[PDB]
Amino acid sequence: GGEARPRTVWLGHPEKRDQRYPRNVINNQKYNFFTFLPGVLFNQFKYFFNLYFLLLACSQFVPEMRLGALYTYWVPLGFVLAVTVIREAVEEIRCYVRDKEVNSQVYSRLTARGTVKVKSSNIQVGDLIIVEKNQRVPADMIFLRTSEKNGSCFLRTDQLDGETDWKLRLPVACTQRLPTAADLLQIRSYVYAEEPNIDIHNFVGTFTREDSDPPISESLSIENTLWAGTVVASGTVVGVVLYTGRELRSVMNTSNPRSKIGLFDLEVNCLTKILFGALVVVSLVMVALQHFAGRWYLQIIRFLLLFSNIIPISLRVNLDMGKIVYSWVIRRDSKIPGTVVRSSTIPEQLGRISYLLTDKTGTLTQNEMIFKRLHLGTVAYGLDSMDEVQSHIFSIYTQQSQRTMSSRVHEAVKAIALCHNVTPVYESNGVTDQAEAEKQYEDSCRVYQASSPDEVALVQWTESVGLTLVGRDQSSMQLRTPGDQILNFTILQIFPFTYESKRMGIIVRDESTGEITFYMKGADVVMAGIVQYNDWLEEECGNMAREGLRVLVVAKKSLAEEQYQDFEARYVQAKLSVHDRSLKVATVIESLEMEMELLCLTGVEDQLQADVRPTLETLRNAGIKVWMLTGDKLETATCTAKNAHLVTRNQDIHVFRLVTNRGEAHLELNAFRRKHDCALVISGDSLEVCLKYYEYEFMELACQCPAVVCCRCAPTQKAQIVRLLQERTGKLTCAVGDGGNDVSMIQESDCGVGVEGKEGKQASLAADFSITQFKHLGRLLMVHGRNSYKRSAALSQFVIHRSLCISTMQAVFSSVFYFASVPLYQGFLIIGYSTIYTMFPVFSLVLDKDVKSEVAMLYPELYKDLLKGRPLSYKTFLIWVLISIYQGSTIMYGALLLFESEFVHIVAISFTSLILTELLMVALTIQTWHWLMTVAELLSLACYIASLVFLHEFIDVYFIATLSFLWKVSVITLVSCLPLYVLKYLRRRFSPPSYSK
Template identity: 60%
Template sequence: MRSDSGPIALRKMLPFSRRGGRKPSTSSDHASDEDHLLMDEELGQKKKRYTPNIVINQKYNIFTFLPLVLYEQFVVFFNLYFLLVALSQFVPALKIGYIVTYFGPLSFVLLVTISKEAMDDYQRYKRDKEANSQIYQRLSPSGPHTIPSSKISVGDLIIVRKDQRIPADMIFLRTTEETGACFIRTDQLDGETDWKLRLALPSMQRLSGDTELMNVEGTVNADAPHKDIHSFMGTFTYLDKTTMAERTESLGVENTLWSNTVLASGSAIGFVVYTGKDTRAVMNTNHPKTKVGLIDIEINRLAKILFLVTLCMSVIMVGLNGFHGLWYIYVFRFLILFSSIIPISLRVNLDMGKTVYARQIENDTSIQGTIVRTSTLPEELGRIEYLLTDKTGTLTKNDMELKKLHMGTMSYSLDTMDEIQAHLASACGKMNMPGKSRRNIAWRVKDIVQALALCHNVTPSFNLDEEITYQAASPDEVAIVRWTEQMGMVLVHRDINTIRLRITATGEYLEFEILNVFPFTSESKRMGIIIQDKQTQEIFFYQKGADAVMSSIVQYNDWLDEECGNMAREGLRTLVIAKKKLTEEAYDLFKEKFHEAEISMHERNENKQAVIESHLETELELLGLTGVEDKLQDGVKNTLENLRNASLKIWMLTGDKVETATCIAVSSKLVSRNQQIYQITKVSSTMEAFDEIDNLQSKTDCCLVIDGESLQFCLDACREEFIEVATRLPVVVCCRCSPTQKADITCLIKDYTKKRVLCVGDGGNDVSMIQAADVGVGIVGKEGRQASLAADFSITQFSHLTKLLLWHGRNSYKRSAKLSQFVIHRGLIISVMQAVFSALFYFAPIALYQGMLIVGYATLYTMAPVFSLVLDQDVNEEIALMYPELYKDLTKGRSLSYRTFFTWLLISVYQGGAIMVLSIILFEDEFIHIVSISFTALIFNELLMVALQISTWHKIMLLSEITTMLIYIGSMWLLPTYFDMSFILTERFVWKVAVITAVSSLPLYIVKIIRRRFAPPSYTKLI
């Protein structure tokens, strides 16, 4: 087998449609049809047409950086408006003050943003460079030689060592492990922490050495690149030089090594089939739509209103002057003068505030381990009205324990498990049990325990203390294997060919050859295995799965459905276990038919399943039913109760059956004590769907439980009617939900209700739902980190939601609302003063404040006190958590609304007018006195207004107020252009400023006292 120009060829086939025709590629990265059939002598040239194996995570390059960053900034209304204002200062007729006055703040904002983007992209560049320069060994006719990852091409034979990252998508040919199998770690690909087993090609593993690969003549057929990391179809056709016959082996996902996974055991040689953009890792690196917080949307609306206010004021000022002369020039000059109404500093203040909130969340020791992955959404935590949650691993611990075993005429629980040990010991010859019936029971017990010890995908491993630990993709399987160990049948060895069990009672070993394994899939809902007892040579097919599919496969019985229902009502997850004995002739026939299906490139999975169903899944002997308990997470009951009291409507979306989900909903207190449960199951017609919806119309306080099929029927047949009724209910439980359904429901609730939706989950099947939500929360659990990495917030347990929403969400929203309105007020009041000044001086568009005064106003003189509002809190933490009902007020959006906006607008008009009119009335004989009196009164007014808005004083707030006042007083000496110190140091200046400040701010303090007395906020009654 040669990778450069030798006898091996790579053929990449276009995917087939379901009808069997070829489906054209939709990706520009895919090669054309002629490139998908590569002849031996063409490989060296043709493979260059595949995408290079280069990792590129950078958003920009040296040429596109500035254009793209500037474009992203100036599509924002705030920045575009101030850019136009700044550019207007180059037009002589529009020039009002110093250009730096207008370009300074804009440049500062852009500099901060550009620097941040540049630093982030430089870090991406360094990571990309490190990944692309990693060294690997490529096998060639002259032996192994080193090559950087970026130079790896399709058709190369690459050697990967233990703990090394897989550089490209490869077919697994050989390994140093004697078993022909190795483990890979996939947490960076799918987020799952469990190791995955991968199998080398049997024909290549049997070669005497690695160099023999260079002499193999063969062809690899692989399907075109696609995103599904759990699916791969291909064949390997090679010339068997012993018989000189052409042989074909099927290639499945178990024979692949995907890029970005890590080899966990041994060394491996892989044949590269996909590189660069065609790899599964890159194709799954999607960039979900950027989420925008509701408060950002609201502020953007207010900014547009402010622009209209600015325009109206400008037109009014010119209109009152009679539209004389170049009136349109004067309109533009007034627009520039009033530009501070739309404060460019608002975006900076809000972004800085969000950073503070994120740090406060991450540093909260009571919710340790919480990570804020999207720092633009903390305020959204205070506006949630719908909570959609997964069950397994989210509400429950995903910590499984087998609680019950039912065998038709016999049932065992935790209290009677010692009987199973006795029966098993008897069946293995250690103990004698009198009576034929007892011996029969012992053999039946041995049958089911042995079936459970064999039918799984668990691999045992030993630590330094020789203790057994188990690796498996499913915690259910680990729980069952641990149970068989406790019963006396221990799984001590497993590889691709062999399973070995140890009987604790006798110390003897049972050894079985693995002939076939049929893994569990979400479509089949079952897994099976064919094994051969090496002692008796008997062949058995074992299968376990969900009762929904197994009940139609096993032999007739009259107890399975009833017992499944009983266990589900106890909150147990059920699995049906069955077996079938196969003759050698029956197995050989199955093997032949299954091989034909395996190597087909058209509907391979369907063909394989059809062979299994026709040759194996008929008349299986029902061995028994297991009930596994998944314990509730700590604090789940209190959390759900608190969130329900906070008026959140909670939906539980789970793949479990109706009975199990209902039981968990009741035990977790998701359903309140007196709440009725209304079930919708097995809906199969439009008439039924409408009847069920009509029945729900009158039930306003009940829990709806609906299965996946009925849900889909309702969504297809009567979507609007169903969602209208369902969203009015306090609790909804959707069972047998697929990941796609979870995401669809999320989008449907968002689109229909226009309310904020939070989704929480812990597994890869929750990622779509989490990304579709307004706020996605991932729990780091036993299913890995995939949900956590895809989420906006990552937590370690469900109970952390209480504090995340009721405390941090409350603070983030209230603080940002207060900060936004105050920054807007800061711009409005100075614009009102400008308008009054111009009106009193013949409507002349002359600037009242220029230079350092206008720059310092939004920075040195007010920024620290205003920004200190991000530390304010209206109630303490104890009150917020003790009375979750307070959260309901937040969802109404009253803290930042049109009402509060226009209230601040009126305050600004009053204060700006009062300060300016009184300054003109009280000024003496020089214009500089108007500036010094009015500006000083303005600064003191803003400091007093900040103090008025503070609910709970923090030492930083007090320090910022005092420091800012001292900075302002000290700057008077440094700015003689604006301040006449001989006048500033007189009593006249002091009393005039004091009177003006009192008139502008004192009435608001009086109003606040009156409102507190006669119409206090709800939370003040609890303090």
């Protein structure tokens, strides 16, 4: 696409455009129709392992290098290509089908004839789109009109930026005042919008109406926007579409899907490179021993083609089928139900994760806040003691019909029920009209709405205890008592919450009594000095914060009438002024905020998902570092980190201060370096500065931390953190998220896990693995990833060992029997054909386990051995190479030594000994025996015996039915295998593996 430019969007009239806009389609698939085959082929053959077979097959076009039949070169290559292409096509088709669900959602569109239904994928720039309550916004729009009489709406944006606060949105003032929504099409208005960009929290634009005789222009900000991926909290809204498809704010924060390859596959590719290099060195030495007798290059080519099975195609086939088995097993595990595998070629990545970068909102939490603790200083009330609070309120409001603990409880509850910015919203339950519910205060139709979910939880709790907030206006508030009596309060003044003040206040007058009261609630740090002297605020606030709760200090100051008049006069005088209005107003308000009576401390919990603490503990014990990358704000992120035990209860936490330039960043980095065993909490902008100037120093300090929390993290910042971890540590990272702001870091990570979000699916659709709950991560790693990694390592190493043993056997057979002849090549091919009788026993290794699933779950320290690369390394590969050379040499030399009679006898003895040796080798390798492995072994042995019988009768051979053959094969197999059995027994007895203890 071309460089982004500002657009003029006319309301309605999508045809009025200076360019063509992309279709409003969310796309997660890696290929289209045109790029599918070239991309799949390139990603297949760009690696040496596949390109080697491709070039081996292509060399047979030259008649000088012809060796054997063409189909022997092309049928296995074609089968591998077909398997890869079918797998990729199935993946793409499933991705398209799953995208159709999001793209086929139906919305209402304003038209001249009326309202019509439109699918999400058919939305055009300039369409007037109706979005209902709790419905996802399908495209980036400007808020124009709402049905609610307050002239505003709340947006849930956690799928877009990971923030728990509800966003208050205001419609365009001109369009909201129109008598009907149909008048939007009868005016000549347009929106001049900025170019499509990546910033989620800023927008620059203008609304212009040319129909009015005086032209009307309105500046547009982020407060007038409804981005795609947000959810309308209540009411039905109308907006004009500005951006669609790939230019959506959510989509522009999303990277292109990529084809991932596992680290194990790269290691296998390196092993194949090493094997080919050894073969080429051997060919060079062989041709040098002949002193390059002429046409030496041709002889080198024939040697490479003759021993080309040293890199067997069966390695690739077995690995592909094994990955199929692992994905099938993951999709059918009922202990982690609903798990979806999308990147089916990387199940072994789950076994080697060093850093887990997790999202907070919607991944660790349920995005549901609950009131948990009420503390009065002398008595604390929890979830089990709320009955006492209810009884206290009941007695307080019964005595009036008919100091003390009841009075203090009542004052605290009334303060919580009044000091907030929550508005009761009444809806329709079918029978009852919206106006009827607002008149009788119907509980079932009442919904509490506020930007702060903590305030909503507080008001809901006060409802559960007896004091119900039933109505609120700009100047009035109504409370319902346990005696169904309404108390009317007049909102004289309100001081709305700001993140800089970290507190909120209100002044009310009780009309039933006439007394004026000033209420304030806020964080402990700011409210400690505001309240009177006490001996329990700091300690109790510390304990409640350590529990993981969001703590608020609730205070109260009774105001005399004259005091209120004086304050009101000074406040009005400060407000009417224009010079330092904010500062003078602050002087007045914090002049009012002093010597307040401390009422209570409140504790609100952001509820964690099921088994989050055990899952995090399991990940920690396995050697995995867990970082929290969230778009939410500092306080909630810290509270959740403590609640989830991402940070230990008695663990120091360093909160990175605001830094704006290089010097401040260096100073704070030194300050944090001076600490030990301290968790790190840093915001997105300070992180930006630190990564700009001190990326290496910050990365080493953060990797030396027990835990890192990055709050207010933009999606690009999350992806950058993932990339920096990969670049610095050199280890695998796994990103876990649930929202659209996690897609970039999921795609960037070596193993992306998407949690199915409550109101969005983009993270699940873009991830390598999709889970329904965070706790499924523990099993998905410790059982499935471990087993996949170990099985792949064992299977690949055994296939390579078998091919190497065959190569050694045929090298000895060619060098010691006849040097060069046609029957020599016949025996070469016969020896090569021995893998058919060991195929099923070898592939039965995909059923092998070292421990049961419960043992792996209960002992996470087994994962650290995987983190060290133990299953596949140079040591195990070298041991396998030595074993293969020894066994091949022993079999061939025993065949040529014991009975040198003929080609037939030596071939038969070596073939039988090799088959028996590989069967015993499979038996020796198995850790936990599955009945299917026994079936494979016995079936392969029976098939070989049947081959020895079907051949004995027809071709004239009687040498099989002889004691000589029996005992010679027995001795050869014993010499090949028994040393390995003794070595295995000694290794098990002396230095057992950690999982056996």
